[PDB]
Design an enzyme around this catalytic site. Structure first.
Site, PDB file in Angstrom:
ATOM      1  N   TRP A  40     -10.934   1.584   0.102  1.00  8.39           N
ATOM      2  CA  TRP A  40     -10.805   0.516  -0.871  1.00  8.39           C
ATOM      3  C   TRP A  40      -9.336   0.328  -1.232  1.00  8.39           C
ATOM      4  CZ3 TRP A  40     -14.130   4.740  -2.343  1.00  8.39           C
ATOM      5  CH2 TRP A  40     -13.557   5.674  -3.223  1.00  8.39           C
ATOM      6  N   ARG A  55      -6.359  10.201  -0.277  1.00 12.68           N
ATOM      7  CA  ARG A  55      -6.923  11.409   0.316  1.00 12.68           C
ATOM      8  C   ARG A  55      -7.741  12.311  -0.590  1.00 12.68           C
ATOM      9  NH1 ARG A  55      -1.924  13.908   3.379  1.00 12.68           N
ATOM     10  NH2 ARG A  55      -0.761  12.580   1.910  1.00 12.68           N
TER      11      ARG A  55
HETATM   12  C1  HEM Z   1     -10.861   5.627  -0.550  1.00 14.93           C
HETATM   13  C2  HEM Z   1      -9.828   4.750  -0.723  1.00 14.93           C
HETATM   14  C3  HEM Z   1      -8.529   4.804  -0.197  1.00 14.93           C
HETATM   15  C4  HEM Z   1      -7.392   4.395  -0.820  1.00 14.93           C
HETATM   16  C5  HEM Z   1      -7.226   3.904  -2.244  1.00 14.93           C
HETATM   17  C6  HEM Z   1      -6.302   4.493   0.112  1.00 14.93           C
HETATM   18  C7  HEM Z   1      -5.027   4.024  -0.153  1.00 14.93           C
HETATM   19  C8  HEM Z   1      -4.040   3.891   0.803  1.00 14.93           C
HETATM   20  C9  HEM Z   1      -2.786   3.193   0.583  1.00 14.93           C
HETATM   21  C10 HEM Z   1      -2.352   2.331  -0.588  1.00 14.93           C
HETATM   22  C11 HEM Z   1      -2.095   3.333   1.737  1.00 14.93           C
HETATM   23  C12 HEM Z   1      -0.829   2.612   2.126  1.00 14.93           C
HETATM   24  C13 HEM Z   1      -1.284   1.208   2.483  1.00 14.93           C
HETATM   25  C14 HEM Z   1      -0.162   0.353   3.015  1.00 14.93           C
HETATM   26  O1  HEM Z   1       0.895   0.294   2.352  1.00 14.93           O
HETATM   27  O2  HEM Z   1      -0.346  -0.256   4.094  1.00 14.93           O
HETATM   28  C15 HEM Z   1      -2.908   4.085   2.654  1.00 14.93           C
HETATM   29  C16 HEM Z   1      -2.501   4.389   3.934  1.00 14.93           C
HETATM   30  C17 HEM Z   1      -3.338   5.001   4.883  1.00 14.93           C
HETATM   31  N1  HEM Z   1      -4.655   5.393   4.643  1.00 14.93           N
HETATM   32 FE1  HEM Z   1      -5.658   5.288   2.957  1.00 14.93          FE
HETATM   33  N2  HEM Z   1      -6.717   4.953   1.330  1.00 14.93           N
HETATM   34  C18 HEM Z   1      -8.103   5.133   1.165  1.00 14.93           C
HETATM   35  C19 HEM Z   1      -8.990   5.437   2.236  1.00 14.93           C
HETATM   36  C20 HEM Z   1      -8.609   5.642   3.537  1.00 14.93           C
HETATM   37  C21 HEM Z   1      -9.539   5.979   4.580  1.00 14.93           C
HETATM   38  C22 HEM Z   1     -11.050   5.864   4.517  1.00 14.93           C
HETATM   39  C23 HEM Z   1      -8.779   6.297   5.678  1.00 14.93           C
HETATM   40  C24 HEM Z   1      -9.155   6.784   6.945  1.00 14.93           C
HETATM   41  C25 HEM Z   1     -10.294   7.464   7.250  1.00 14.93           C
HETATM   42  C26 HEM Z   1      -7.423   6.041   5.288  1.00 14.93           C
HETATM   43  C27 HEM Z   1      -6.379   6.193   6.148  1.00 14.93           C
HETATM   44  C28 HEM Z   1      -5.072   5.878   5.861  1.00 14.93           C
HETATM   45  C29 HEM Z   1      -4.018   5.837   6.847  1.00 14.93           C
HETATM   46  C30 HEM Z   1      -4.090   6.316   8.298  1.00 14.93           C
HETATM   47  C31 HEM Z   1      -2.933   5.288   6.234  1.00 14.93           C
HETATM   48  C32 HEM Z   1      -1.553   4.990   6.812  1.00 14.93           C
HETATM   49  C33 HEM Z   1      -1.571   3.652   7.530  1.00 14.93           C
HETATM   50  C34 HEM Z   1      -0.232   3.304   8.120  1.00 14.93           C
HETATM   51  O3  HEM Z   1       0.483   4.239   8.538  1.00 14.93           O
HETATM   52  O4  HEM Z   1       0.103   2.103   8.178  1.00 14.93           O
HETATM   53  N3  HEM Z   1      -7.310   5.652   3.979  1.00 14.93           N
HETATM   54  N4  HEM Z   1      -4.139   4.390   2.104  1.00 14.93           N
HETATM   55  N1  DP9 Z   2      -6.438   1.462   0.977  1.00 11.14           N
HETATM   56  C1  DP9 Z   2      -6.211   1.285   2.280  1.00 11.14           C
HETATM   57  N2  DP9 Z   2      -5.162   0.575   2.606  1.00 11.14           N
HETATM   58  C2  DP9 Z   2      -4.642   0.211   3.921  1.00 11.14           C
HETATM   59  C3  DP9 Z   2      -4.439  -1.293   3.948  1.00 11.14           C
HETATM   60  C4  DP9 Z   2      -3.475  -1.720   5.059  1.00 11.14           C
HETATM   61  C5  DP9 Z   2      -2.276  -2.604   4.602  1.00 11.14           C
HETATM   62  N3  DP9 Z   2      -2.749  -3.548   3.530  1.00 11.14           N
HETATM   63  C6  DP9 Z   2      -1.644  -3.354   5.802  1.00 11.14           C
HETATM   64  O1  DP9 Z   2      -1.547  -4.587   5.814  1.00 11.14           O
HETATM   65  N4  DP9 Z   2      -1.226  -2.568   6.795  1.00 11.14           N
HETATM   66  C7  DP9 Z   2      -0.336  -2.950   7.946  1.00 11.14           C
HETATM   67  C8  DP9 Z   2       1.067  -3.391   7.523  1.00 11.14           C
HETATM   68  N5  DP9 Z   2       1.768  -2.094   7.424  1.00 11.14           N
HETATM   69  C9  DP9 Z   2       1.143  -1.036   8.241  1.00 11.14           C
HETATM   70  C10 DP9 Z   2       2.271  -0.703   9.244  1.00 11.14           C
HETATM   71  N6  DP9 Z   2       2.513   0.537   9.638  1.00 11.14           N
HETATM   72  O2  DP9 Z   2       3.000  -1.578   9.704  1.00 11.14           O
HETATM   73  C11 DP9 Z   2      -0.050  -1.770   8.886  1.00 11.14           C
HETATM   74  N7  DP9 Z   2      -6.983   1.801   3.221  1.00 11.14           N
HETATM   75  N8  DP9 Z   2      -8.290   2.065   3.277  1.00 11.14           N
HETATM   76  O3  DP9 Z   2      -8.804   2.210   4.428  1.00 11.14           O
HETATM   77  O4  DP9 Z   2      -9.039   2.182   2.249  1.00 11.14           O
END
Ligand code: HEM
Ligand code: DP9
Ligand code: HEM
Ligand code: DP9
Ligand code: H4B
Ligand code: H4B
Ligand code: CAC
Ligand code: CAC
Ligand code: ZN
Lengths: 404, 406
Positions: free
Chosen positions: A280, A111
């Site tokens: 990413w 974020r």
């Molecule tokens: C810029 C790079 C970004 C990084 C490094 C990042 C990293 C992460 C990581 C590591 C998680 C947990 C992933 C997992 O364990 O599945 C996460 C969750 C999440 N990210 Fe990001 N994120 C980024 C960009 C974004 C963007 C562009 C959005 C949306 C506009 C976003 C929305 C979310 C949401 C909604 C979750 C939770 C997903 C869930 O509940 O399964 N992320 N992000």
């Molecule tokens: N850096 C991330 N990471 C999000 C990557 C998603 C993650 N590797 C995945 O497999 N997500 C699934 C499994 N767990 C989430 C769930 N709630 O069950 C959805 N997001 N992004 O947009 O830049």
């Protein structure tokens, strides 16, 4: 009243007053805490108030709050909702809401980037083949030849009586899961069900461990359509270790674009059932969870043996030793193919910062501690020592039942 | 479906429902609005005491399978009677041994609960002097250390009495290292223990100046100030650390003691409050190797060891931190095994906690657990508890945090 949040490494303290802006409720109650749980489970006046609220956030956002454009724009929603039972957002508003929805994602550690978001308005989509084009452009753009850029593509909002536009896949890019003969699994096990659904809709399967899946796109009230992604659009990274020549020989590889595509995007009362987003990866998503989860590619023991470790006893910490090299491999590889990636150290450092920027700007920041802390070396990162408060703010990304 | 919290293990895809949480009398820090689950700290008149005691009493008789019996109803009468005529009441021997184990069994932050039924309860409710308190503790340490083949144990001192002062152990653990505040600002030894080291000095302790000087005990009998006792070195078994292959690790002169003995937690049973009731088991290698030794605000030896390993500590993506942290833990494990002191790594430890969960599921309908505390400081998702969801809630008997007596 207001929670006292303490960081035990620096001994500093804040008071989350933003949590008071939480309208939606969570799983926990005073009797018991369910914060470690992954998953959980809106008429006329409800919408209007959600809308007014979001429109208020919007105008406060551009400082032109309580001005004219605001008062009039509030009349537009009032009028449209009262006449049609719903209303629509404006490009700028949608752009604001998306960014807000990401800024409020409690489980996201990236974020700090919430400000730079390329928002694509695909609300003029009327067909799965149109969806496919939008999705393909998102990829070209987001990927930017290994120089990733966080982006989102918003498709037609949901509508009463009509079916939802849906992208059946979890992420825009995933490897097939071929449940074979002996109940075993070739490929990515978390993608068995979806890989079958594709075959069932006429997809010619593969026989590899990293077969890039095809996309099933669904336009309202119409069975899902199968589309194949141009091999060129889908960038991938070959994994090789910095000092272990034998590593590369494992053939391990992973795509560069992480793009969740099954989450619902909610803004000012409106629900966008298909709004894929991507930024990413954080090295640990690939090297720890995807490759080392026992129910995933589970390659822990292989790399272990390859490292001539003692897989006999737990106390030799072979698993730990192997997990670290696998993550290192990812960081090296991605960095070699000049593809954007962020290790969990640098990443948590930035989130720590984000909490600071947010403490100043909104008086708090929603965070799910169990998800913010990396899967390996948690305590070695600033986030582990930081107390967090978790609540639901809107705009917000929510989970939604699979379309089948 | 069932009307109780639904718990899923994402590794095995299995499900269970926690029906046990229904027994939680005390509310936690969360609300249907915000979850304060990641916070470490978040904050009983006559009539209210009676009901707490009746609860415990029922709990006791059920453990011996005699709910509704004569002894049970005759025992409830007794409790009412005593509280009625004095304002408080006392526990029978076996009632104490039962609560002490339920307290451990209920402890939501302990990954070692699979051993709960094996605890050794030393009663000491007859203790009346700070001096005697020292005797009791020394026995505990001797028995619990048992030369390295450690044994779970807990010594229970007199319960809080109306008006009269509490029995207290000022130190946080029967065994802790000194935290010497220097001039430049740094701390020699363990920063965690700076305040207690200053309190021991203000009370007459003649401080040393090592990186690992064992603190003396500040014990407090009712209403008296605290006397200062020094543990005889022969009783405080310690373990010099060395790596199994990195020959130079032994050169760092790092060491840790074998016995983990929390001693400032209030043990609460059936309403009664035992302000001094030190318990001890044995270490999980990550406690020493990752927290005490690698935390930034503790010994902070990560950079040092990284440098010894010729690692690129200039950039994060080199994973130098992850690399050293691992070797350090391995060295804690190795050295302990070598010296034949009991210890359990985070892998074995967590695996045994899954077993505990399966057990308790069949015995009570669930098990209260703090995810953030159960999941290890390192290699988190490599251990099975990471993949196990869990419900947290307060059950009694229990161990509670209590304000420092100063
Ligand atoms: C810029 C790079 C970004 C990084 C490094 C990042 C990293 C992460 C990581 C590591 C998680 C947990 C992933 C997992 O364990 O599945 C996460 C969750 C999440 N990210 Fe990001 N994120 C980024 C960009 C974004 C963007 C562009 C959005 C949306 C506009 C976003 C929305 C979310 C949401 C909604 C979750 C939770 C997903 C869930 O509940 O399964 N992320 N992000
Ligand atoms: N850096 C991330 N990471 C999000 C990557 C998603 C993650 N590797 C995945 O497999 N997500 C699934 C499994 N767990 C989430 C769930 N709630 O069950 C959805 N997001 N992004 O947009 O830049
Ligand atoms: C026998 C082996 C045991 C093992 C390996 C074990 C392990 C652990 C670990 C790893 C922690 C967390 C330490 C931390 O992060 O600060 C812990 C916490 C705890 N354990 Fe155990 N434990 C054992 C025995 C005991 C005994 C005998 C009792 C009590 C009678 C006990 C009571 C608790 C309590 C109350 C906590 C939490 C204290 C707090 O909130 O700070 N444990 N245990
Ligand atoms: N194995 C243990 N371990 C207990 C671990 C104690 C830990 N090393 C410690 O110093 N705990 C303090 C600091 N943090 C906790 C808190 N809530 O502030 C108490 N217990 N046992 O009885 O066998
Ligand atoms: C049960 C537990 O909530 C679950 O395993 C969580 C823990 N932390 C996580 N953290 C991240 N980033 N991603 C996940 O999928 C999970 N899974
Ligand atoms: C802020 C956060 O609650 C804090 O760092 C917690 C996290 N998990 C923990 N887990 C254990 N076992 N022990 C601890 O001291 C902590 N500290
Ligand atoms: C490459 As393998 C041992
Ligand atoms: C190897 As050492 C300094
Ligand atoms: Zn909670």
């Amino acid at each position: 009243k207001f929670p006292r949040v303490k960081n035990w490494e620096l001994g500093s303290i804040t008071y989350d007053t933003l949590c008071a802006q939480s309208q939606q409720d969570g799983p926990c109650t005073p009797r018991r805490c369910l914060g470690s749980l992954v998953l959980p489970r809106p008429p006329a006046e409800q919408l209007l108030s959600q809308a007014r609220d979001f429109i208020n956030q919007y105008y406060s956002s551009i400082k032109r709050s309580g001005s004219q454009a605001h008062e009039e724009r509030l009349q537009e929603v009032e009028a449209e909702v009262a006449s049609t039972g719903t209303y629509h957002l404006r490009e700028s508003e949608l752009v604001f809401g998306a960014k807000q929805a990401w800024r409020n994602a409690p489980r996201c550690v990236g974020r700090i980037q919430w400000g730079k978001l390329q928002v694509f308005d695909a609300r003029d989509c009327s067909s799965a083949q149109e969806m496919f084009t939008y999705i393909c452009n998102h990829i070209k753009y987001a990927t930017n030849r290994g120089n990733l850029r966080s982006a989102i593509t918003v498709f037609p909002q949901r509508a009463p009586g009509r079916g939802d536009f849906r992208i059946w896949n979890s992420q825009l890019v995933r490897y097939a899961g071929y449940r074979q003969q002996d109940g075993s699994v070739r490929g990515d096990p978390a993608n068995v069900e979806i890989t079958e659904l594709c075959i069932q809709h006429g997809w010619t399967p593969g026989n590899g461990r990293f077969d890039v899946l095809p996309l099933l796109l669904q336009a309202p009230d119409e069975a899902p359509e199968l589309f194949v992604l141009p091999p060129e659009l889908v960038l991938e990274v070959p994994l090789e270790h910095p000092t272990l020549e034998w590593f590369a020989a494992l053939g391990l590889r992973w795509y560069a674009l992480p793009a969740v595509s099954n989450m619902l995007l909610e803004i000012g009362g409106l629900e966008f059932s298909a709004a894929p987003f991507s930024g990413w990866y954080m090295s640990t998503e690939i090297g720890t969870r995807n490759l080392c989860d026992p129910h995933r590619y589970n390659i822990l023991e292989d790399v272990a043996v390859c490292m001539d470790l003692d897989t006999r006893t737990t106390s030799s910490l072979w698993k730990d030793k192997a997990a670290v090299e696998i993550n290192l491999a990812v960081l090296h590889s991605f960095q070699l193919a000049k593809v954007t990636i962020v290790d969990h150290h640098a990443a948590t450092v930035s989130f720590m910062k984000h909490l600071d920027n947010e403490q100043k700007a909104r008086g708090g920041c929603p965070a799910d501690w169990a998800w913010i802390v990396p899967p390996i070396s948690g305590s070695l990162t600033p986030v582990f020592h930081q107390e967090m408060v978790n609540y639901i703010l809107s705009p917000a990304f929510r989970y939604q039942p699979d379309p089948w």
